[PDB]
Amino acid sequence: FEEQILEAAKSIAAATSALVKAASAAQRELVAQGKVGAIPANALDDGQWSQGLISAARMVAAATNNLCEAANAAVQGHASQEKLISSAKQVAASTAQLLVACKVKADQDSEAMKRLQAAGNAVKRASDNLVKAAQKAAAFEDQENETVVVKEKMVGGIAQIIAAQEEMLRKERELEEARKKLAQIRQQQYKF
Amino acid sequence: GIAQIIAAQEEMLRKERELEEARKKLAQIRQQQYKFLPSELR
Amino acid sequence: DETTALVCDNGSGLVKAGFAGDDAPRAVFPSIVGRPRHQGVMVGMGQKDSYVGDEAQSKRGILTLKYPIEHGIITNWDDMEKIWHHTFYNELRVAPEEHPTLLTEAPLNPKANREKMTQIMFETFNVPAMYVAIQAVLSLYASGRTTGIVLDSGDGVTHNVPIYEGYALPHAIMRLDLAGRDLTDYLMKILTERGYSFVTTAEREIVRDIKEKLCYVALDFENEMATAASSSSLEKSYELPDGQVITIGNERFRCPETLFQPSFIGMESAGIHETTYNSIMKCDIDIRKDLYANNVMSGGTTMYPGIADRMQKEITALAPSTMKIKIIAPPERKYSVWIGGSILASLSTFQQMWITKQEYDEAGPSIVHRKCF
Amino acid sequence: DETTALVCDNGSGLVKAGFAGDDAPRAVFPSIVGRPRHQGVMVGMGQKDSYVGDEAQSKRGILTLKYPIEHGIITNWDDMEKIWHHTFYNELRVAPEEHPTLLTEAPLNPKANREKMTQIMFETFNVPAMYVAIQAVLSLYASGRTTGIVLDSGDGVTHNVPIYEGYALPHAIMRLDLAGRDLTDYLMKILTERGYSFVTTAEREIVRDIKEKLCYVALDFENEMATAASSSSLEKSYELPDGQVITIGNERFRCPETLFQPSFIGMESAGIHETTYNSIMKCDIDIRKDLYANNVMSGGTTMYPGIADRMQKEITALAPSTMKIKIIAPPERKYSVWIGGSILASLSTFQQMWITKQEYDEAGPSIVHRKCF
Amino acid sequence: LMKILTERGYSFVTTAEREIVRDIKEKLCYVALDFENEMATAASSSSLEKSYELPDGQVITIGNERFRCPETLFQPSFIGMESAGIHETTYNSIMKCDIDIRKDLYANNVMSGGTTMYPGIADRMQKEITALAPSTMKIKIIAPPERKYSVWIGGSILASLSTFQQMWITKQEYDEAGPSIVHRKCF
Numbered sequence A: 001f002e003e004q005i006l007e008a009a010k011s012i013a014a015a016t017s018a019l020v021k022a023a024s025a026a027q028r029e030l031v032a033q034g035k036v037g038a039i040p041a042n043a044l045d046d047g048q049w050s051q052g053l054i055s056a057a058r059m060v061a062a063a064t065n066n067l068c069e070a071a072n073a074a075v076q077g078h079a080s081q082e083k084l085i086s087s088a089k090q091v092a093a094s095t096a097q098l099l100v101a102c103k104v105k106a107d108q109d110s111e112a113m114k115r116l117q118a119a120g121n122a123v124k125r126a127s128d129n130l131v132k133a134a135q136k137a138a139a140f141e142d143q144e145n146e147t148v149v150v151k152e153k154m155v156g157g158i159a160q161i162i163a164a165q166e167e168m169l170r171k172e173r174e175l176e177e178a179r180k181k182l183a184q185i186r187q188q189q190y191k192f
Numbered sequence B: 001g002i003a004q005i006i007a008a009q010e011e012m013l014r015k016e017r018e019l020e021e022a023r024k025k026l027a028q029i030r031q032q033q034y035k036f037l038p039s040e041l042r
Numbered sequence C, D: 001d002e003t004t005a006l007v008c009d010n011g012s013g014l015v016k017a018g019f020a021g022d023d024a025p026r027a028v029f030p031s032i033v034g035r036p037r038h039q040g041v042m043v044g045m046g047q048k049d050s051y052v053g054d055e056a057q058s059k060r061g062i063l064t065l066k067y068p069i070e071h072g073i074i075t076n077w078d079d080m081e082k083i084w085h086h087t088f089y090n091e092l093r094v095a096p097e098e099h100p101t102l103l104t105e106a107p108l109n110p111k112a113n114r115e116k117m118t119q120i121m122f123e124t125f126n127v128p129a130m131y132v133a134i135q136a137v138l139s140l141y142a143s144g145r146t147t148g149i150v151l152d153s154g155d156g157v158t159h160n161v162p163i164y165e166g167y168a169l170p171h172a173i174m175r176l177d178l179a180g181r182d183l184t185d186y187l188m189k190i191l192t193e194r195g196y197s198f199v200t201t202a203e204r205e206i207v208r209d210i211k212e213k214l215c216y217v218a219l220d221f222e223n224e225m226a227t228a229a230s231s232s233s234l235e236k237s238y239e240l241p242d243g244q245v246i247t248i249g250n251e252r253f254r255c256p257e258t259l260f261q262p263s264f265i266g267m268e269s270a271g272i273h274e275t276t277y278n279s280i281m282k283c284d285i286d287i288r289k290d291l292y293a294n295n296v297m298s299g300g301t302t303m304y305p306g307i308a309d310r311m312q313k314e315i316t317a318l319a320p321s322t323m324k325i326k327i328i329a330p331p332e333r334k335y336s337v338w339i340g341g342s343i344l345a346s347l348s349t350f351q352q353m354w355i356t357k358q359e360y361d362e363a364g365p366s367i368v369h370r371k372c373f
Numbered sequence E: 001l002m003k004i005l006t007e008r009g010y011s012f013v014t015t016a017e018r019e020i021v022r023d024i025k026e027k028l029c030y031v032a033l034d035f036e037n038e039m040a041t042a043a044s045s046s047s048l049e050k051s052y053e054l055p056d057g058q059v060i061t062i063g064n065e066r067f068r069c070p071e072t073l074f075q076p077s078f079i080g081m082e083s084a085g086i087h088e089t090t091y092n093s094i095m096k097c098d099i100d101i102r103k104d105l106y107a108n109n110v111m112s113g114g115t116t117m118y119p120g121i122a123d124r125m126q127k128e129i130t131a132l133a134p135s136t137m138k139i140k141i142i143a144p145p146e147r148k149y150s151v152w153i154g155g156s157i158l159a160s161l162s163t164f165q166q167m168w169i170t171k172q173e174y175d176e177a178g179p180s181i182v183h184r185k186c187f
């Protein structure tokens, strides 16, 4: 249960250490070939690309550390299973950004490119493994109590369908507002 | 910074679960629609 | 848990009142106020000033019956207030000041009618909250649909309201004053042809009973007239309250035919089928199909045997041949409006639509035009 | 292995979205935003604020439909963001923050349009990378060619882009606002000539369907007009959503004729054949033979029956008799642009052309003018 | 106007009652300069209420319906039509023209027909188009007092011209070309 995700957590840690090493090597290649003028200055502290791709790798590591903490909270019963997939999606976005950033800024068949791509794919697949392990271990993986409910009264039944259908439209309003809030907080994240 | 983003994703996904179960509830009502609806009303 | 709401459909001819959540009105009684028109001679009896509802219907021999509601418009406010008091305290036997009250109204009614209803509900009966709904919307609620053109024909008002996916089309709303009471008057006029003279209001009630018991809508008016003129199989008999027996022939279908030929009573308007077709044709072209497939009927006037088949034939003759015409006529449609109101009064969502007396006291009776359609 | 890229052709009329490597878009839906224009009465429904895509196409009766893209230029950015939502989360049902997104744009578009597209794609959806390609180049990619002049006629923009051996000639790029939507408007105008009145946006969609079902390009306009005026063979019928049947004659080929005679809608510009010929003549003399031999048509507006033959005849009449003119009109050209994008999104070399969000963060939205043609 | 007169309890149904309502419209309706301020004034004061005697002797009193009826010309959504008001249609028609002639069109807005005889319609049209057009442009609404007969007067002027005498569709041309000749000689 908790030991299962811990093994996958250590797999996550090893894969992210591989990411750190590969990103450092790629940064060495970029500064050696003059692809980018790397500056050893921590702009906006870590930021996202202070001193280059190493900051992106570090932020990926922070995101996956948050993912591991979320998995631990779930296996302790304090985090919803939808927290795990949200943190995993953030980690996937981060590693995709790092991989694409290194992809266009380096040589076509650079060996460091291959190391970064393989290591990022490893982190992605191991993240899905950890997420599925935590969700299946979670007792709230599948649960529903809405199989069949009926009302004898003709008035009661139609009122029942109308209440459920209003619940439809209310949750759909929640769709709109929640997405708009997420979009606003993404725009405010850096605002260029 | 990323804490707000992950929190917004939390709300989005939990509400997605809510929307899905609401869909299930609506369909679950709909299969028994014939029961309290007369024949001419299906 | 929550205090149940009162649903009171004040029709032109009948009052249907009950509690939200119930599947049938608890009190259905005629909306008449009778006053004695003779001289009382014995001290023990004959001293009451006015009789309301079924009490007046049992004493029509010595009473002058008056309907406070004419063509959906309340004309005598003292009488209507008396009827509401009789509904709350004698029929329902509840305190109106602890239950929110849902009232109904025909579309395109005068604004003063709705404002006076609100003021009476809040200052005379002191209800916690109240709401005026449109009868056609409630009728659509009762049928468990969100799309359709409702043809509500009561005692004083007939109206077509088209609704698509919960949206009403106010420009396409049709209102025709021909209704059950006009049919009763025309039945009196044509019953004079056989030598039966009904003049007094009690005789009007007798003719209304005859209409409810023996009248029906003919599938083809000309063929039915020819059959009645040749055979004698349509001659039905009816026993008057004094034992006299009357026999009526073509009048059984010549009276409801006024709904499809208003020119019988000197009205220039077109029949209910043409009004329905015109209301559909005033809607957007993309929703005409769904309206054609969801013709909803409600009200007592639509209880005539064979009215659905006649309406289907007429609209099929009017509409393009490709589209399918379906008349939805449930057997309980005479209460459909009220039933719909009950549903609307039981919804948790509707609990925010009430006009509370806080809003009434801060905004006045004009608040009813900002919160009710 | 690698994360697949998203290809989203944001046409003026239709949105075609899918994944790189696929041979057909996974989500093709109209790019419209509909808002209710009536009053909602039922409380259990009629409550959503805006409908996007096919949903709006199913509810056009009660909606005002607006295209956020007009003449290839995005005018309503909130509506465009809503459409991108409906594409990513509902139709494709993916997370844009893990897939690079390839977008398309007509040539000679305003710079602010492209900058706002980049800013929205990076700050609202947080895609790892993005790229804005020229639709004609993608259309050439789809045909497996490196040389040819592409005539791309979408819903809002018709542009000619000549390309020779992978090199574009920007000075020879021609753009014309005359496109499918203008053809639909002209069809409405000339359908009023037979007594059919289409006014609302829903009726505009109906007329667009009529155009897509019955219109064709005449090989010879004058002879076709004479034939239509003498015989009635060209007359064709069509059933409206309400069941009415309309019959159109010469309007079947007068609407697409605007493509070749823009003066029909009062525009001074020359027809598509003359614009293509002028674009070819603006190129170097040594490549005109190949450009003549590699005319590639793409876009929905080029799906008219017989348009290829008419274009071939017109350009043959314009070009010298020695040149060999070949119009390449693949049967799947309505998706050609998208298909080309898919190909471009699957190439290993193009993986170095992405605009990563690192560059966007360090250089701002202006970076899209240093990395995209 | 019939539909909104039902709001005060006046029921006009027959075609004759439609003619009566048309007369009421011609006698009492006007266009408000500012619709919202006019509605507030009508809801506050009774100065906008006017009386009218029906052919049967009954006297009706109408308030905001005097200006709420012609306002449909500027807000067609009042009758469920999706189209824009007359001011927006005029502005769109001007914007559909060539850029070089928009100035002269802006300065030569000509109104005609009975429906343009409403008191104060010219001022409302001028204000709306000024709000739509660029501030620099000068806008002039030409509303002659006899504009209810402008079409007929122009027809008389045209038919009195010697040059127009050659544009007559003669019944000679009709007999050889049929009714279709009217699509070749008239705009």
Ligand SMILES: Nc1ncnc2c1ncn2[C@@H]1O[C@H](COP(=O)(O)OP(=O)(O)O)[C@@H](O)[C@H]1O
Pocket: C010, C011, C012, C013, C014, C015, C153, C154, C155, C156, C180, C181, C184, C208, C211, C212, C213, C215, C298, C299, C300, C301, C303, C304, C334, C335
């Ligand atoms: N079975 C019936 N057949 C024909 N007419 C009927 C029947 N039942 C009721 N009616 C007519 O319908 C009218 C009552 O309609 P109702 O639905 O009560 O309308 P309201 O909303 O005015 O109460 C009465 O005047 C009566 O004449």
Ligand SMILES: Nc1ncnc2c1ncn2[C@@H]1O[C@H](COP(=O)(O)OP(=O)(O)O)[C@@H](O)[C@H]1O
Pocket: D010, D011, D012, D013, D014, D015, D153, D154, D155, D156, D180, D181, D184, D208, D211, D212, D213, D299, D300, D301, D303, D304, D334
């Ligand atoms: N089979 C057809 N025949 C004629 N016109 C068509 C056909 N299919 C689509 N169209 C027109 O083409 C337009 C869509 O073109 P499309 O290639 O989707 O352009 P965009 O790139 O703007 O999406 C529509 O407006 C429609 O009117």
Ligand SMILES: [Mg+2]
Pocket: C011, C135, C153, C154, C155, C299, C300, C337
């Ligand atoms: Mg009723």
Ligand SMILES: [Mg+2]
Pocket: D011, D135, D152, D153, D154, D155, D299, D300, D337
């Ligand atoms: Mg296109």
